[PDB]
């Protein structure tokens, strides 16, 4: 989407593979705020908003 | 999150919101993630 | 309330202990009042702070 029309998807009722994102490493910046960038984001989450 | 809390009660009194205490048990929580700024009540009718 | 002095003493002690327990669950300027979540939501270097 364009910046102004930011598109929001709700990630609900599914298990997540956070480590594929981390080990891909093709992501230029993978900066994490409030949650660990050291593979500790694998926690139970009520709401994941993308 | 859009949260709806519900409670059902019998009533025997005419008008003007009879007194009493009743905690509202939660009913549903819709993970919609949308913006709500206005709401219109919906009422059915009868035809004969 | 004939034994009000002893009751006041035990009430003050109970209030002090309750205040200590409540202060245990205070944020103290951190992100959360629980430390295990800090360990799980931060790497060791950032979490130390």
From Swiss-Prot, chain A:
Effect of residue 28 to F: In strain: Omicron/BA.1, Omicron/BA.2, Omicron/BA.2.12.1, Omicron/BA.2.75, Omicron/BA.4, Omicron/BA.5, Omicron/BQ.1.1, Omicron/XBB.1.5, Omicron/EG.5.1
Outcome of substituting residue 29 to A: In strain: Omicron/BA.2, Omicron/BA.2.12.1, Omicron/BA.4, Omicron/BA.5, Omicron/BQ.1.1, Omicron/XBB.1.5, Omicron/EG.5.1
Listed result of changing residue 21 to I: In strain: Omicron/XBB.1.5, Omicron/EG.5.1
Domain of life: Viruses
Free-text function comment from the UniProt entry: Attaches the virion to the cell membrane by interacting with host receptor, initiating the infection. The major receptor is host ACE2. When S2/S2' has been cleaved, binding to the receptor triggers direct fusion at the cell membrane. When S2/S2' has not been cleaved, binding to the receptor results in internalization of the virus by endocytosis using host TFRC and GRM2 and leading to fusion of the virion membrane with the host endosomal membrane. Alternatively, may use NRP1/NRP2 and integrin as entry receptors.
Self-association state and partner proteins as the record states: Binds to host ACE2. RBD also interacts with the N-linked glycan on 'Asn-90' of ACE2. Cleavage of S generates a polybasic C-terminal sequence on S1 that binds to host Neuropilin-1 (NRP1) and Neuropilin-2 (NRP2) receptors. Interacts with host integrin alpha-5/beta-1 (ITGA5:ITGB1) and with ACE2 in complex with integrin alpha-5/beta-1 (ITGA5:ITGB1). May interact via cytoplasmic c-terminus with M protein. May interact (via N-terminus) with host bilirubin and biliverdin, thereby preventing antibody binding to the SARS-CoV-2 spike NTD via an allosteric mechanism.
The protein's name in its UniProt record: Spike protein S1
Organism: Severe acute respiratory syndrome coronavirus 2 (2019-nCoV)
Lineage, opening ranks: Viruses, Riboviria, Orthornavirae, Pisuviricota, Pisoniviricetes
Shown residues in whole-protein numbering: 348 to 397 of 1273
Curated annotation (Swiss-Prot), chain B:
Superkingdom, natural source: Viruses
UniProt-reported outcome of changing residue 16 to G: In strain: Beta/B.1.351
Effect after changing residue 14 to E: In strain: Omicron/XBB.1.5, Omicron/EG.5.1
Glycosylation sites: 35
Function: Attaches the virion to the cell membrane by interacting with host receptor, initiating the infection. The major receptor is host ACE2. When S2/S2' has been cleaved, binding to the receptor triggers direct fusion at the cell membrane. When S2/S2' has not been cleaved, binding to the receptor results in internalization of the virus by endocytosis using host TFRC and GRM2 and leading to fusion of the virion membrane with the host endosomal membrane. Alternatively, may use NRP1/NRP2 and integrin as entry receptors.
Assembly mode: Binds to host ACE2. RBD also interacts with the N-linked glycan on 'Asn-90' of ACE2. Cleavage of S generates a polybasic C-terminal sequence on S1 that binds to host Neuropilin-1 (NRP1) and Neuropilin-2 (NRP2) receptors. Interacts with host integrin alpha-5/beta-1 (ITGA5:ITGB1) and with ACE2 in complex with integrin alpha-5/beta-1 (ITGA5:ITGB1). May interact via cytoplasmic c-terminus with M protein. May interact (via N-terminus) with host bilirubin and biliverdin, thereby preventing antibody binding to the SARS-CoV-2 spike NTD via an allosteric mechanism.
Name by which UniProt lists this protein: Spike protein S1
From Swiss-Prot, chain C:
Coiled-coil features, chain-numbered ranges: 7-49
Full-sequence range covered: 943 to 991 of 1273
Outcome reported for the amino acid change (mutating residue 40 to A): In strain: Alpha/B.1.1.7
Biological role: Subunit of the fusion protein that is processed upon entry into the host cell. Mediates fusion of the virion and cellular membranes by functioning as a class I viral fusion protein. Contains a viral fusion peptide that is unmasked after S2 cleavage. This cleavage can occur at the cell membrane by host TMPRSS2 or during endocytosis by host CSTL. In either case, this triggers an extensive and irreversible conformational change that leads to fusion of the viral envelope with the cellular cytoplasmic membrane, releasing viral genomic RNA into the host cell cytoplasm.
Record-given protein name: Spike protein S2'
Effect in UniProt of substituting residue 12 to H: In strain: Omicron/BA.1, Omicron/BA.2, Omicron/BA.2.12.1, Omicron/BA.2.75, Omicron/BA.4, Omicron/BA.5, Omicron/BQ.1.1, Omicron/XBB.1.5, Omicron/EG.5.1
Lineage: Viruses, Riboviria, Orthornavirae, Pisuviricota, Pisoniviricetes
């Amino acid at each position: 989407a364009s910046v102004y029309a930011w598109n929001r998807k709700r990630i609900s009722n599914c298990v997540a593979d956070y480590s594929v994102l981390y080990n891909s490493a093709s992501f230029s910046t993978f900066k994490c705020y409030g949650v660990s960038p050291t593979k500790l984001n694998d926690l139970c989450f009520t709401n994941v908003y993308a | 999150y859009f949260k709806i809390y519900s409670k059902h009660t019998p009533i025997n009194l005419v008008r003007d919101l009879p007194q009493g205490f009743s905690a509202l048990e939660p009913l549903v929580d819709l993970p919609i993630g949308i913006n709500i700024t206005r709401f219109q009540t919906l009422l059915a009718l009868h035809r004969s | 309330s004939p034994l009000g002095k002893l009751q006041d003493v035990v009430n003050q002690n109970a209030q002090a202990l309750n205040t200590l327990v409540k202060q245990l669950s205070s944020n103290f300027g951190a992100i959360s009042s629980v430390l295990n979540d800090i360990l799980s939501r931060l790497d060791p270097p950032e979490a130390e702070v």
